[PDB]
Structures are given as structure tokens and as C-alpha cells.
Symmetry: D2
């Protein structure tokens, strides 16, 4: 019941099911996973593919010879399973040299090193067939106010993404970039903290059409924001290139719970929107099986991500297909929201006495929105109470 | 000591010192202020001018005759005091007809009414000499997921701002718009919830150059965000048209405390940035004297907004003028942050072996940022301990 | 399907379905309800009873004659419907005299007035058969640090509750008190901000056994806290006298959404706990139908509170009755959590070499908790996917 | 200027200045510190003493022989410097065996192991002269609702603290316990999440007088709570045995910034209260020098903790000594807050017509609190603008 297939386009980072459980107060509770074992185990669970940071796949400092061996082993697992690699990304956050950032480190030589490390992995991502290159600037930011001039940092950030876009276009690569916002952690404040800040920054890049966002459920919720709303704005701008699905219990540290956990109703409205909008990218799970779990709990948690998506997809489809819901949507004037306010144009609106001089403001004010009956229909559908 | 003058460009909304103290659980604790009395009292405190919503100045439903009388009285107070009106805005939030929004109400006739109400007040703002027209979409949003298709709402929002920009340009008005973001309250979630979301939306408008942001200290702090960072991004984009100054104690209801209260260190870094960047707009206080206060407390609170700005301006100037601070900034490589990462260009960076092949990552990793000594210098300056 | 009966003990405040929609930025969108009409409408929806503040029932300033008339009318509606009044409370927050508190106002004469106003309504509550008297100190607190010495305020707060307990015991009344915590709003910070702070304060009162807590879902969530955990601590202490059910979307202003909205999974675990623990008090809904709604939306929202409770009660019962869940609970050692750590006593534990000297810490560390499979069983039950 | 002396009672955990910089996304940026070097370096900065977890001082798994050697080395550093050890604590959070808790682990054998590990370190703490034994239940809690029955966990938690109190009293030790609350991180929710919940729990222990709280600035701020208020309640209950000082920027992950950073005004009101109340315990800094820092930044950060305390102590003393402030406090009726509401007793209050029948509610309502002028005096003192 509710079984995923590779057509559902579910993907997982190596670093997700492979998280050993080391947290700021505790050592690892699980041994490291061979990326080949993860590929095979995820393929049996019905996943469509995997993603990776460079350092998840090739241990940091690997010689060029060890590097090729690690890739060849990985490629063979992809060939044996049919798994794809739709997305890749760079680790610009773990090694101590990145303690003040990569692209916006105050030290110029670290910024150049950061760009060279990224470019090396773009080549590899393209070799493996990735369509999207994600950038999560986890160390770009500050704990104190004088440490970072944010306008200079934004200049440096734009400079880095512009150079990466020059590299991609000069190589003829068919790959696009996706900025993954996060409001804080591990820096006190992280630059481009939300979907909106990333969308606004992109519009200042030399080639804006190469760049979109990879929003994460938990990250926008770490600022108390409505994740489905943020996704709707990304869709409206044409910039939802990729998405990270997981769960988060409000404003606290980045929990990365399995998808469906955390804010369940938000997950429902997210699935409703992705499916209604015809999102056709990967459904990527950026999550961490809790460190209480052994390896069987890891795979149970990963299976749960997929199951919860498929259950919510069924309930959202049932909600939208229900005539009583369709009738309720009309009662709340969702149909009117979709109509132009003034397709008759400015001058017609200015001479339309029914818009102002003869508008009956009290009759309008008295009409109820009927939103609560609509939301209870939505609740009943989610819970399978109809 | 620390006395404001009209050259300091301090401005106040009528609705700020005029807030009667009605909150969701309590009745008014103060009688209504005549806008003429506020103008005269603020001018004696050293303010530079006032702002208004249409309904602050002209009671809702006023005949055209009463309207002219209210304006004429107000104009005479401006002439007697020398006070300016740099900014005006529309009340699209108080009257029950706006309970589901103005520009993005589901009811089309309310949206048209909302546009006509705004256009009427733009004419008045221009008559009074306002340079900036603010839009705070306080009712644009939702409490439940099905109530608002956010993509349709964004279409309607863009349609409204586009029509207003057509109106302004067709009249030849020299006025620009400034969107005031707020993440929530009074709606469960408000559209365009942060500075970043508003900046991104503007880039989809037909005439983006007419529109900027009017960020509010407390609003970005209601999402846990770093307000000086958000202001830096607005400045970097060239979009800080106006700013609302006040105080807020973290993530809760919109307190609108006087400026300097709330997050004091954030206020310091904000003043440092506005003054370093040469912000030359109004320093507008969107605040509410607490309802514990009588009228003398109102004017004490308003004087405090200005005093705290002027004290922080002095401490920030002293901080930046201090040679030991200038030396510390170099020690933390703020000077390197301001230099291009790769002005030698992509190809030079790709063949620069010192950026990767021969980069000594451990030597780089070992260099301390010296951020804590810098921040303690900043703390000592703020507290006048040097 | 899922129909409430008066045996389900669902109750509503007059002020809930009677909220006119006035918020800090907007006027009322609904006319005032006659308390008699609310009683009759709620009884037809299946409610068991109503609660009231004194000022909900008797308009403030009413003569003793008008007072008796208002009570007599109300009593007749209770007799005609069979509705009970299980709980009553005092409005110590709306009138401007309470702007700095009632029990902990800095002005002594306001504190005495506050006590006399409460005592008058205790008499009335007892006349109407109320078992619980709630105290929500909404104005007890401060916006600034010097305004309130909190130790003095706590002395005054204890003095007030002690005098009320003396009054009750001297009259021979069979009524107990329940403190309703709230972390903030309308004060910047409210005293006794959470369930824990109220539980701790009670233990310093002269007659602790007269006092318990009335926790509210949304209030503990306004501090980011786990409401089921807080309820479990109240139960463990024997102090859950009453409970307020509603919904809240994280850390922001007090939304008072209908129960089931907000954090749906938290609502599920709350119902599971109340029913497992055999809570037998009223299921009270302290909620506000959103101001978008007309009167039909009001009653739809109130019906939804009850429906969602009954749906969650069914899913929690199914979860706990499921053998596979019972097996999973054993796999995660919930049975071991319920056993004493050291019923053999201190000396036995100190000489038990298997507890330390020969404890195999790595074998213990390797056992997975199996929490994720358990939580997915809980998710599947909630969603009716088994 | 502002130099600490050992009479200022400033103390530091070994784990604070010794934090290597490993965070959930990054490796260590600093080498490990020898506890002897920390003792000597802190003594030269003017600290009064150090605290430790067992595993900070004796590496986990150390033979009894290595153990004695580690203690002897440490003792010699204390003797050479004059440093005290006022407080000690147990690491029940790092090792994987504690992944589901120590005292409230679901596995009974882990709970017994947890108690034996604690008891071993109590003996050592007493040997070294510690007055307070802290308990921070960082792993006691859950990420999902079914994983932990909170009433059973509270039974287990009480059982553990009761056994520890039996051990202490049976040995005749002069040591008291202090529970350190934290709302979340590393568990999704932690048991006894705030000062209030810990104070309430203590009152159910067999020997409540052995137990108090060790509140941490940042932890209560992680729930959005007012830390000075929480400290005032702890003082009022007589339970502030110890305190952890640091900085935190609102509701997010546990930053542990140096004291004075984060909420500066809250730090001021905290110092004002500790000094006014005559707190005479250690001023303990539970902080982490940011991982951007090298070892010189570590010691600069630690010096800053102490400096900021001493600057704030001076400004708070100046504030309270200022006649104009003393006059303002009377104007705001702080003197009336400190007087009994009804020392004349219940019957006198019931027959006092000036408390109700003849109370002039409108005259009372019209009196302003004058809180804003008071708070601006407090602001001017903090900033040294008088
Ligand atoms: Mg992610
Ligand atoms: Mg504003
Ligand atoms: Mg309530
Ligand atoms: Mg601590
Ligand atoms: Mn995350
Ligand atoms: Mn505001
Ligand atoms: Mn509430
Ligand atoms: Mn901490």
C-alpha cells in the first residue's frame, strides 16, 4: 500500500541516510555507510536517485588516483541499480578553512580556493548527469556585527555565482544552479536567509536565468515562515528548480526530521501545491534519521519520507476532486481571486462609479469568506474522515 | 545634550503618537489626538515631519466638503510649524471590508475599491509634497491553506502595483512606492513576509524602478532575522527608499516599542550602517507609546526614539573613527572582503595553482578571524567604556 | 459521523463564538451575540456547557438591578437547554484601569479593586454551579525592565491568590482555582509565563491544594514548547484542573484557531494523553472564529473544534489498540521506562557491578530505539492509512 | 579599567574555553586544551575558579590509575594558582549510550549506569571542594510523541534525583544539586524545559531543600522568555543556587555567545537584579568562543565575559543610585508595588467601600504609569549618556 516507484522521482542525499549521528553534544551513534551500499539500499526502497556533496563521495584530500577509483565504484552502483544522480553540490562548510565562509570568507585566498573546489565538482556532476547544482552557503554569515560588511559580502557572493555561470556557459554545460537558503545555523545569521532573499539576489546576477532556488521545508520554518507560501512565490517567479523535503518543529535548531513529521498540515498544503502546479523536478529528502536509530531505523525513516509524500498526494488529490470542495472554493470566491482586478484598464477603473462612489462598503463587509468550512473540508480529507 | 533638529530628518506617523492604546484585549487608555496638535507637539520636540494614512487625516466616509476642511486645517499646521510630509500611505486594513485584504481580497469588487481608495490618497500625498508612498499589505494573506491561492494572489498583487505605477507615470507625479513587509499579524501569514520577498516581487513589476522597500525593525525581527543584514541587502539592491525605526523583543506579536528598545545592539549596527552608507531618507518612527502611558509618556516616548538614534549615531561614529578599531578591522580582513575575489578573471583563476593545487589549506584554516576582539571593541564603544 | 454529545463534555467561552473580530488593526466584523443566543446555538451543536468572564455576562458598570436581570435571563437559557456552567473567570484585562495589571498593578488601590471584582464573580460562579474558577493574568507583566520588580509582583500575586483561597474556604465554597499561563501578549512579558512557572508558583501558596493550572494549547506553543509534555507534567503533579483547546501556528501572536488547526500532530498526542490518563474535566475551547467569517462560519468553526477532537480520539484509540503498535512500544522499551530504575535501592545499585564495572557500554550504545518505525505507525494511524 | 579580581567570583567551565569548535556541520578548528593550561590561563585573566564535567577532566574509559593521575595534575594546578572548583557536573550526553537519555533512558540498564557515573563524580566534586553539583539533562526528551511517556519519564527523573539526594545525605556531603533547564537541543524537546518547569519538579522531590536551579541566559531565551523575570522567580522561591551567564540572539540554536552579547538590555537587567538581590554564588560563564577564533580569540572572548559583567554592574549601580531615577521609581509607584495589597485582611477589604463601591475607576484609569520616562533613564544610564 502506497509503494514508491522510480517514477515518483524520490531522491536522497548520500549525507542523509549516511548521517552518523554526530551532533554538537554527542558522538556518532552509527558507523559510516559506503556510498555504494546506500545506492543499493535506496534503490530497493523505491528511490529514483541520489545526490552528493563532493566530500560525501571523494574523501577530502584524495589523490587524483583515489578520486577516479571512488567515482568508478559509484558509477558501477548506479549502473547496477538504475539510480540517477539529478543533483550535486559542494561541501563548503565542514573543513576548518571554511570557518568564515567559502564564497564570502573575509580571506581572499579562501574565496578563490572555494571557487576552484566548486568548479572541480561541477565537472563531476555533469559527468554523472546532474541537472541541478545546489549551493548551500552554510558558513556565509556572521556571529557579530562588525565581522562582515554585508554589502561587500553580497558583492563577493555575486562575483562567485557570476564566475560559476561564466564557467558553465563557456564549457557548454547543461546545468543550472539552485541556491538553498537557511536563516541561521551554523552561523549566527546566514546570508540570503530565506527563499525571498535568494530570489531577490538572483535578479542581480549577470545571467539570472541560470539560477533558481532549492528551498527546504525546515529552513523557512526556522524563521516561522509559511513554506507553501514561499514555494508559491518561487513557482510564480519561475524559479523552483529543486526542493528539499523534511520536517521541522517550529523555530529552533535545524531538525531535518523525515518528511511528514514536523508541521503535518503544512506538508499537506505543500504536496497539494507541488502537484497542482505540476512540479516535475526531483522530490529530494534532505533529512537525518535521528541518532537514536540503528541502521534498520535509518531505512525505516527513509521509507517513511516517501510513504508520507504518497499518502498526502492521495489526500490532496481527493480534496481537489471533491465536488463539495469545488463548491466550497466557489463559496469563498477562489474563482474571483483568479480573475483580473481591472482587465478593463486604469481609465475604466477610474470612471467606474461602482468601484468607489457607489460601492456599498457595508454590504461587501458583511459577506463571510466561508474559510472555516473550507478548512474543515481540508482537515476531513487529510484525516480520511471522508 | 543629544538634541534633535529638523536636519536629522526624524519623522513620525500620525498613528504613532496618536495610538489610543486599544489592543486585542483592552480598550483605549488615551483620548484621540487632533492631527494638528500632534504636528505642533512633534515640531517642538525637534521632528522634521509627519506621515499619515488617509484615514488618520480624513475620517472614513467623510464628505468631499469635510475632506477639504480636514486638509486645510492640517496644511495650516504644517505652514505654522515648518513640518514636512515626506511619506503617506493608505489604510487598507481597518475597515471590515478589508478583512480578506485589499489588493488581494478574494472578492474582485473589494480589490477595485481598494485601488480607487489608494489612488485618491496618492493625489493628496502629492499635493502635500510626499516623496514616498508606502504600501503595508497587512490584510493580504490567510489563516488557512485553501483560503488563498498564493500564485493568483501574487498575480493580483502585481496587477495592483502595476496599475498604481501606470497612474503615477500618466499623471507625471514625482513619487515612488515602498512596500513595507510584515511576516504575520493581523493575518496568520502575510504575503511578501520579509524584505527579501518584497525585493524579489518588485523585480517582476512592469516598472521596477518605481518601487522599493520600507523595512521595519520589528517586522524582520518577528521572523528572527537580522535587521541590519536585511537593510544591507536592500541598500545593495538600491531599494531602501524609506525605513521604519522601532524596537521589538524577539519573535512574538508586533510590539512597536520606541526605537532603541528591544534589540539594542541591532539598533547600534543599524545606525552604523545607515550612516556609513549615507542613507539620506527620513528616519521614520513607526512605534506605539505603550498603553500604560498618559500623554506626557507619549511625548517622552517619542523624544526617546530620537535621542536613542542620536546617541547610537555618536557611538557608531566613534567606533569607526577609532584607530584601534581600524587596526582590528584589518586584523579581521574586512579590507580583504572588499577586494574582488578574481578580478584577474575565470581563466587566470583556473590556472592559478596557488588557489587550489598548491593552496595550503591547513595554514589558512589556522588563521583566527579575531572577530571577538573586534566585537568587544564594538561593545566598549556602544557602552561608552572608551 | 463523529457527532458530539453532552457526554463528551465540550464547553465554550461566551467570548469565543461571541468574539466580534476586533483585532489590533481592525474593527469588528460581526455584531455582538446575546449570551442567550450563544447558549441555545451551542446546545444544538452538541456542547455540554459554557463559560464566562463576569463582563461577558453582565456589562461593565451594570447596576445591581440590571445585573440580576442579566443573570436571570442567562439561567433561563441554561434551564431550557440543559447546558452547564463548569467554569467561570474574571475580566481583569479589558478596562483601562487594568492597564498595568489587576493583582499586580503597581497602584495598590487597583489591586484591591481587582480582588473585590474577582470575589463578586466567585459568588456568582458558585451560584451557577461552576467547579473551577480560572485566573488569566493577561495584564500582569511589563514592557520594560524597571517598571515591575518581579519579586514584589510575585509577593502581590501570592497575596491575592491566598486571599481568594481564604475567601473560598471561609464561605465553604466547593470551587478550585486554575491559573491560565500565557508567555506574552498583551504585555511584553507576562508573569508566570508557562505551565511550569504556574505549577512552581502554586507550591508557594498557603493552600496549594486549592490551585491547579488551566493550560492553553496556543499559549505554550507561543514559547515553542511541547504542549503534550507540559500537560503530562501537570498531570504528573496532579494539577490539571481544566484545559483550553485551540490551535496555534508556532511562535507569533495568540491566534486562538479552532482546535485541530495549527499543530495537528501535537493535537493528536494531546488527545492520546488526555484519554489515556483518564482526564475527566471539561474539554474547553478557548478559540476565536477568524474575523473573515460571518455567523454561519462562527458555528462551523465551533462545530469543527468538537469534530476534530472526536476524530483524533478515534485515531489515538486505534493507535493504542493496534497489536503492531503494542509490539513496537515493547521494541522501543516503553515498558522499561515504566519500571523503577532501582527499586532494589541505593546500596544494591552501588554494589551492582552490572550497572557500572561490568556494564557493556558499547553493546548498550548499539541498540537502536526503533523510534522512527513507532512514529510512522503513529502517522499511519493519524492519517487513516491503516 | 574594569579589571576582574577573584573576589568577583567569575568562573568558567573547562568545556567553555576548551571547546574545539566542532559543530553539527564542521570539524574542530582548535586543538584540545590541557585542563592545566586552562586553569593557569584563566587565573591570569582574573577568574576565581573552574568547573568541569567528569569527562572534561578524566578521559572516558580511563583506568583507575590514569584517573588518579589526571586529578593529581589538576589539583596541583589549582594549588599553584589559587583557583577554586565551586561546581561540578556529569557528562550524561556525549557518549552514544546516552542517545536516549541518562536518567530517563527507556533502557533500564542505561539509567542505572547513568546513576553510577554521576555518583562517582559527586565523590570527586566533594574531594575538590565543590558546593554545587549541576545536572543538565540534555538527552532527556524525545523527537517524536510515542517515544517517551512523559509521566513515566518524570517518575524516573524523580527516582534518580531522590537516589542522589539519599546518597549525599547518607555520606554526609555538604553539596546541593542544581538543575540546568534547556527547552530543546540536542533532543527535539527536552524534559523540564524552563526554569519554571524545573522549579515545579523540585517540589515533588523527597528532599526539596537539596535542589535548586542553574538557569542559563541563552536557554530561557531559546523559548523567547524574559531571563531576568525567570531569575526573579527563582530568587523568590529561594532556589537560585548557581547561574550560567552567556549571550543568545533570540529563538534559534543554542549559541552560547560570550556574556553581554546577544540581548544586551536583558544582560543589564539581569546584573541589576543579581546585585540588588545580593546573589552571592559564582558568576559562571557557560559559553563557547566562536569557532572563527584562534587561541588568542578564546582568551579575548573569556576576558570579555568578565568585562561586560563589570561594566553592566557599574551602570546598574549608577542607575539605582541616581536621585532622578529614585524619583522616577516613585512616580511609577514601584514603592506601592512593594506594599501589601490587603494587610488589613480579607474582612476589612470586603467592607472597604473605597476598594469597590466608591472606587473611582476612571480617575484610576487616567493615571499614567510613567514607564517610558523611567525606561529612558535606564537606557541613558546603560549607554553612559548621564
Ligand atoms: Mg537542504
Ligand atoms: Mg511600519
Ligand atoms: Mg484561554
Ligand atoms: Mg549551561
Ligand atoms: Mn536542514
Ligand atoms: Mn510594527
Ligand atoms: Mn489564546
Ligand atoms: Mn547553552
Amino acid at each position: 500500500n502506497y509503494q514508491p516507484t522510480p517514477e515518483d522521482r524520490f531522491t536522497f542525499g548520500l549525507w542523509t541516510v549516511g548521517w552518523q549521528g554526530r551532533d554538537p553534544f554527542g558522538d556518532a551513534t552509527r558507523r559510516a555507510l559506503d556510498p555504494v551500499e546506500s545506492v543499493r539500499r535506496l534503490a530497493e526502497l523505491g528511490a529514483h536517485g541520489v545526490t552528493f556533496h563532493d566530500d560525501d563521495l571523494i574523501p577530502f584530500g584524495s589523490s587524483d588516483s583515489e578520486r577516479e577509483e571512488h567515482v568508478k565504484r559509484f558509477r558501477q552502483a548506479l549502473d547496477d541499480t538504475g539510480m540517477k544522480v539529478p543533483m550535486a553540490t559542494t561541501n563548503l562548510f565542514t573543513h576548518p578553512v571554511f570557518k568564515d565562509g567559502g564564497f564570502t570568507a573575509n580571506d581572499r585566498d579562501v574565496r578563490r580556493y572555494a571557487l576552484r573546489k566548486t568548479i572541480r565538482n561541477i565537472d563531476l556532476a555533469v559527468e554523472l548527469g546532474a541537472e541541478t547544482y545546489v549551493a548551500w552557503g552554510g558558513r556565509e554569515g556572521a556571529e557579530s556585527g562588525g565581522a562582515k560588511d554585508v554589502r561587500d559580502a553580497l558583492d563577493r557572493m555575486k562575483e562567485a555565482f557570476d564566475l560559476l555561470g561564466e564557467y558553465v556557459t563557456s564549457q557548454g554545460y547543461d546545468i543550472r544552479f539552485a541556491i538553498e537558503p537557511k536563516p541561521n545555523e551554523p552561523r549566527g545569521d546566514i546570508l540570503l536567509p530565506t527563499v525571498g532573499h535568494a530570489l531577490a539576489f538572483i535578479e542581480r546576477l549577470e545571467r539570472p536565468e541560470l539560477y533558481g532556488v532549492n528551498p527546504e521545508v525546515g529552513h523557512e520554518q526556522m524563521a516561522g515562515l509559511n513554506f507553501p507560501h514561499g514555494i508559491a512565490q518561487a513557482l510564480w517567479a519561475g524559479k523552483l528548480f529543486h526542493i528539499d523535503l523534511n520536517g521541522q518543529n517550529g523555530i529552533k535548531y535545524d531538525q531535518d526530521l523525515r518528511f511528514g513529521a514536523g508541521d503535518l498540515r503544512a506538508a499537506f498544503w505543500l504536496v497539494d501545491l507541488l502537484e497542482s502546479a505540476g512540479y516535475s523536478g526531483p522530490r529530494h529528502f534532505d533529512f537525518k534519521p535521528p541518532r537514536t536509530e540503528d541502521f534498520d531505523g535509518v531505512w525505516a525513516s527513509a521509507a517513511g519520507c516517501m510513504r508520507n509524500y504518497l499518502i498526502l498526494k492521495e489526500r490532496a488529490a481527493a480534496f481537489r476532486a471533491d465536488p463539495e470542495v469545488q463548491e466550497a472554493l466557489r463559496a469563498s470566491r477562489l474563482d474571483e481571486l483568479a480573475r483580473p482586478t481591472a482587465a478593463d484598464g486604469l481609465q475604466a477603473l477610474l470612471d467606474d462609479r461602482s468601484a468607489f462612489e457607489e460601492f456599498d462598503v457595508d454590504a461587501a463587509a458583511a459577506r463571510g469568506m466561508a474559510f472555516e468550512r473550507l478548512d474543515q473540508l481540508a482537515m476531513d480529507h487529510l484525516l480520511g474522515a471522508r
